[PDB]
Write a protein that binds this DNA or RNA. Structure first.
Lengths: 84, 64, 50, 97
RNA sequence: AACCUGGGGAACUGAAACAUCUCAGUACCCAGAGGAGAGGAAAGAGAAAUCGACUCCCUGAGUAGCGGCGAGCGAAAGGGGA
RNA sequence: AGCCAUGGGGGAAUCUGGGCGGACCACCGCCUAAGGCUAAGUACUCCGGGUGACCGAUAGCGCACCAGUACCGUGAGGGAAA
RNA sequence: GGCGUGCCUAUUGAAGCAUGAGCCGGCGACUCACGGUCGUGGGCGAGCUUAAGCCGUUGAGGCGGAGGCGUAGGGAAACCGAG
RNA sequence: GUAAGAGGAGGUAUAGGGAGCGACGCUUGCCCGGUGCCGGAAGGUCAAGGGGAGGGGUGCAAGCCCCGAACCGAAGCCCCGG
RNA sequence: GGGCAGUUUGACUGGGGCGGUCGCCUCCUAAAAGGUAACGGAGGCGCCCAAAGGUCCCCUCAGGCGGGACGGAAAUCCGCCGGAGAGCGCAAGGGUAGAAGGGGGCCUGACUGCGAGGCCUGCAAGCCGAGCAGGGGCGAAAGCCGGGCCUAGUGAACCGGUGGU
């Protein structure tokens, strides 16, 4: 067989991925305190009774429904409007 | 003959009066300092389910 | 690390508590911060113990 | 390997010293809607011949029930079961005189 | 033949490891007594001014405690009876 | 960590003497230690008599029978067939 | 003449140049005790049932409530009490 | 050998046990830093013990019970040299 | 005190041993949700700030050329230009000047009793939070405050130390 000086490495380390994305979209009701956007930076700025927490994360604040927005010179918006 | 109720379980469990095994919150001792009061009172009472089958099945004899 | 260590704050006017940390290295003599105890409203709070 | 969920902490306060247990009076409660069923008088030694109580040292009236005048007979009595007893009934405390 | 009292008294095995704990104060070694053995009248029990040698059964009770609070081991009092 | 039991050392008293009621102290009870004997109720089956939703010569006791026989090993012991 | 890779165990997968078996007979392996537990067959029903024992029988049953289960839970505990 | 006692040995440092080498001829150099071993009446650390300044429970108190410093308590390891 | 007794003496793993490795966070492999293996690639965490925290008043950079005693590629100031290449402790990724960055004033919400309803997930644990209520800081107000721009800085239980009830 013969197997001279081989070796090893150092890269056997991969951080556990955490479930990251958006949870509730428009057309979907959310009733007060239901997270809907998991993000790192502000990929999705809040708005109309949308709420962000201590880690960039959008959640329900009204018992209503989501919808979207694109304000280039301001960012990307999410708005959870309920009913009258 | 007679089974044997579990000492440990008994002396650390709260199976409710409805076949529900619901114990106490775990993770409070050498902790506390750089931690939210949130974490303090949320390490109060607990819950749990599923393996509580085995818990009930172990309670037994005086049930409890 | 024990240099920043770990201490706690009690009220004057008999006992009371609240959970905190320190930093002896940094210009940290003693501390009389201002918090709330279990009883009544906000008051003093004195530094003590490990 | 892991503690078979034994990771759950204990809360059984005063779970045991060594001189056995403290000899205290254990009471016994009874729904006074069960009381509404029968009529006459309810002594300790009587109600255990019936189907409740069973040598339960002391009796505390409690539960829901109806405004029926009778001679309840016991030791202590629930404050909220004492409000159904105002509607009608007699109240004897601690027994012997 | 087996049971019975006392003196010596393990290990596997369990705790999926292994000492502490288990198995067990069991197997076996020794001593001796007898149709029984042993036990036996309270320096007890236990909380009530409550009972009244000893062995036996059931219940109390897998209760109360014991415990690297794990394995698991596991009382007497009271009660009904012999 | 009481109580019971005690191997070494110290070392009492006689009814205001004294053990215990689970550190220990007060009290209030409880029982009278450091001498001995006691049947029966319980256990056991070499033994005999009765019974069976027990086996029917590989099952059944190891052995239905000339079995603790042949024969195997020095030996303690093993253990047939029929 | 058409066709046709033994049986088992184990394998991703085997006829196997993997294993087990010469052949036939008989023996031979998921039980039981107590507790627990889901149901299910009935009787009773806010009630249910007795263990030891005692009596009777010669396969004859019967007394025997001591106890266990049930009517209430919450809390570590005191205690509160349909809260 | 738990022990009584046994061998040693009714032998006595030219005698008895243990180790390395292995006739005889030549010869056997440096290191006491780690360690083992020899000794060394100052000393550090440390045991039960001895001691009692000082604290507490409890009784009205007499008292009883527990906690316990100073400081004296070995072997030993450290220390010192060979 | 191995002289003798009973026991420990990890696992992975292109056969095992040596070497390396074990958990936490980032970026690929990861095939536009999630997620997705390897002794597959690339680096980081066991700490820091009582101000680097919390509110109110406020400013905006790195750089480019031109101009100047020391300075002079680059200490400093000035002119004009300059939409994030600066900074935001620490690795990278996300993000950010309509602030999270940088200066000052008062302070101390690294608050209590709770928590609707969601993330995530085998369990466990971890993540997020409106509002309620006590009272508290600042703010003219509107209002924010259950530490830090966010993801690493962490250890269920059994044992007990210490203050209290």
């Amino acid at each position: 067989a013969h197997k001279k000086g081989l070796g090893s490495t150092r890269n056997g380390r991969d951080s556990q991925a955490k479930r990251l994305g958006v949870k509730r979209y428009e057309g979907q009701v959310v009733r007060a305190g239901n997270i809907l956007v998991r993000q790192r930076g502000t990929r999705f700025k809040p708005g109309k009774n949308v709420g962000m927490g201590r880690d960039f994360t959008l959640f329900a604040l009204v018992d209503g429904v989501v919808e979207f927005q694109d304000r280039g010179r301001l960012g990307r918006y999410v708005h959870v409007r309920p009913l009258a | 003959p007679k089974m044997k109720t579990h000492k440990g379980a008994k002396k650390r469990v709260k199976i409710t009066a409805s076949g529900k095994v619901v114990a106490m919150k775990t993770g409070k001792r050498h902790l506390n300092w750089q931690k939210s009061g949130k974490e303090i009172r949320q390490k109060g009472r607990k819950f749990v389910l599923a393996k509580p089958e085995a818990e009930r099945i172990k309670l037994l004899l005086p049930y409890e | 690390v024990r240099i920043k260590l770990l201490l706690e704050c009690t009220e004057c006017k008999r006992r009371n508590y609240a959970t905190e940390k320190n930093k002896r290295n940094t210009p940290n003599k003693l501390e009389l911060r201002k918090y709330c105890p279990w009883c009544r409203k906000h008051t003093v709070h004195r530094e003590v113990k490990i | 390997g892991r503690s078979t969920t034994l990771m759950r902490l204990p809360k059984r306060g005063m779970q045991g010293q060594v001189p056995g247990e403290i000899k205290r009076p254990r009471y016994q409660g009874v729904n006074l809607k069960d009381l509404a069923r029968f009529e006459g008088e309810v002594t300790p030694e009587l109600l255990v011949r019936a189907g409740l109580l069973k040598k339960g040292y002391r009796l505390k009236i409690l539960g829901e029930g109806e405004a029926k005048p009778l001679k309840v007979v016991a030791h202590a009595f629930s404050k909220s079961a004492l409000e159904k007893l105002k509607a009608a009934g007699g109240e004897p405390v601690l027994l012997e005189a």
